[PDB]
Write a protein that binds this ligand. Structure first.
Ligand SMILES: COc1cc(/C=C/CO)ccc1O
Ligand SMILES: COc1cc(/C=C/CO)ccc1O
Lengths: 356, 359
């Protein structure tokens, strides 16, 4: 507890390095300010106004008392920096706010909005286990598959979802929203990968957002969503079968699609399932719509940072990871597949076609 | 919606993901500190293989693959490096940023990190929207979300109840002052010319005043802070001493210069103005006011990265303190209302500047 040389140049360098560290450890402030913006329906209230909205009118619409309007102003300034909104001053300080392009992803009226995924991701269920991550890392085989289970009395995310209907709904809605956008990019960027197919099984396809878009875009593909037992998407060439992809036989088709599924699981069950696909597809192909971590299409620093953040998220609450091409290729080889082709799609993700 | 628009939106989505997953940065860095990774690697003295690192951290070899993934994250963040040994089994070393993580360095950021990610500071954010919607007519309002989420208790009261949390905060401030003061006396040497005395209001355990006193032998430095803050180990020097009191309600010691380093940002305009008026009167009984703090819109912190961090601090302070990061306009207004006649801003670093304010 008692009190403990450096030249000025070094002191200044280190002083100027500190804010990078502050920015990292205060990262949760981004999470929480964005959540507030969603709780308050800020984007929707601004959109509804129809043109830039003055701070006082924004506060009134948000049921924020005028005494607290200066705090709202500061929250808005944060959200403007993050890229969601713009601000201007038309009175010679009352700003007026409008929408920036990134706010398209916040608007309730857009079926691709990220609201539910945001609420899910910042939920106590997903944040809290991180305070036991170090203890979990230090636990030998009191062990659990991940930090999430470690902090939930041994319960994996599937079990917690069955107990927490709200949390479960958020997760489901978040996946559906992503599928809305991803599928549309997929059928455009990878049109060639669907040519010549007459059937496809969408493993883990849920309410059918991915298959709906595939069926609409390629009218000769009979799509079957295969998943564990709201209303599901309707289309004449879209149907549904129930089953466990690990223990039940996957429906036969010209292509087996895994969209954001294999990343949830470790090598041993994935390999076992891939081998079963190998036996079944012999002759069709595997279609994996997921992350290839080191791929050229997502190798910029910002993209890599977000990929690694996802790898950490997945490490904490799922049983998988974001695999590199080398890791994928090793799984394909051991599963008996002979060839593969990667086509970039977007959103940190690609299509891998795998041939048996 | 056409394909081009769908792809554009798909490629924009990870920006939002990165925002809402910001707490992952907070928690992975906290893990690195809990596990003492920087010091373990430093003690090893050369790059350390993954298996040896797991052993050194008391992580079972069975969980080494998870450690590898945590390290990959931390390497991206810039704390560590992976030293390539072959054209698998990664070896890890230290990056320059890790200097701020090492326990042996008096300027390390460990305590501030632990303080900042603590439940006390994170949890009130889950009530921020409710607090923003609370009016002053139900008896439920509080000065900030922190108090709203702590049964009305401000951070000062929670610190008085939570000795560990309090110690983290104080150590955090001291570490920053160690660096900031050394930058201050170099980049703003002329600001100290001609002074015979200085009072460091909120100067804590004396890291700022110690450096001033050593660098400028004519300046008698007095740290003025709360009794409990100045009753323990602190910097000592023959021209440095400590006086105790409350800056809001007790008379601030007389000096040629009154210094506020990262203090006025904690408080709103009404008490700050009152205090500045008291200083104006004292400094013309001419002395000067010295404010070492953020000027939000200063050129030295205008880059996107710096502004992002400044706004994050502005949010942090909104949640648990009663202040903000002021713009030049806001500062200038305070100085005018307090009766000062001139000012000069000189950049120091760490998002902050020195404002000299003259009566
Ligand atoms: C629950 O939060 C998230 C989950 C995923 C999961 C993708 C595939 O299982 C991706 C991003 C998130 O923010
Ligand atoms: C408790 O966490 C923090 C507090 C401050 C306070 C500075 C002046 O009062 C600055 C940065 C932090 O991370």
């Amino acid at each position: 507890g008692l009190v403990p040389h450096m030249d000025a140049a070094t002191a200044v360098e280190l002083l100027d390095a500190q804010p990078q560290v502050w920015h990292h450890f205060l990262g949760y402030i981004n999470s929480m300010t964005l959540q507030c913006a969603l709780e308050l329906d800020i984007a929707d209230v601004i959109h509804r106004h129809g043109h830039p909205i003055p701070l006082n009118q924004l506060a009134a619409a948000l049921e924020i008392p005028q005494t607290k309007a200066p705090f709202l102003s500061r929250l808005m300034r944060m959200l403007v920096h993050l890229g969601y909104f713009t601000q201007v001053i038309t009175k010679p300080v009352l700003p007026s706010y409008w929408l920036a392009p990134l706010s398209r992803l916040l608007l309730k009226q857009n079926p691709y909005n990220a609201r539910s995924l945001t609420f899910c991701s910042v939920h106590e269920h997903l944040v809290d286990p991180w305070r036991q991550m170090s203890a979990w890392l230090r636990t030998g085989k009191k062990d659990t598959p991940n930090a999430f289970a470690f902090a939930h009395e041994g319960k994996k995310v599937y079990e917690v979802c069955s107990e927490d209907a709200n949390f479960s709904q958020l997760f489901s809605e978040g996946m559906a929203g992503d599928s809305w956008l991803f599928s549309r990019a997929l059928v455009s960027k990878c049109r060639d990968a669907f040519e010549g197919l007459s059937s496809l099984v969408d493993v883990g396809g849920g309410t059918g957002n991915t298959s709906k878009v595939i069926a609409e875009t390629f009218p000769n593909i009979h799509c079957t969503v295969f998943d564990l037992p709201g209303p599901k998407q309707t289309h004449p060439n879209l149907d549904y079968e129930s089953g466990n992809m690990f223990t039940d036989e996957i429906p036969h088709a010209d292509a087996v699609l895994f969209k954001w599924v294999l990343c949830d699981w470790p090598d041993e069950p994935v390999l076992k399932m891939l081998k079963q696909c190998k036996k079944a597809l012999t002759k069709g192909k595997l279609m994996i719509a997921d992350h290839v971590l080191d791929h050229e299409s997502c190798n910029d620093s910002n993209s890599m940072g977000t990929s690694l953040i996802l790898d950490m998220l997945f490490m904490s609450f799922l049983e998988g990871s974001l695999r590199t091409e080398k890791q994928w290729a090793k799984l394909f080889a051991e599963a008996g597949f002979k060839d593969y082709k990667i086509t970039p799609v977007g959103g940190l993700r690609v299509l891998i076609e795998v041939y048996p």
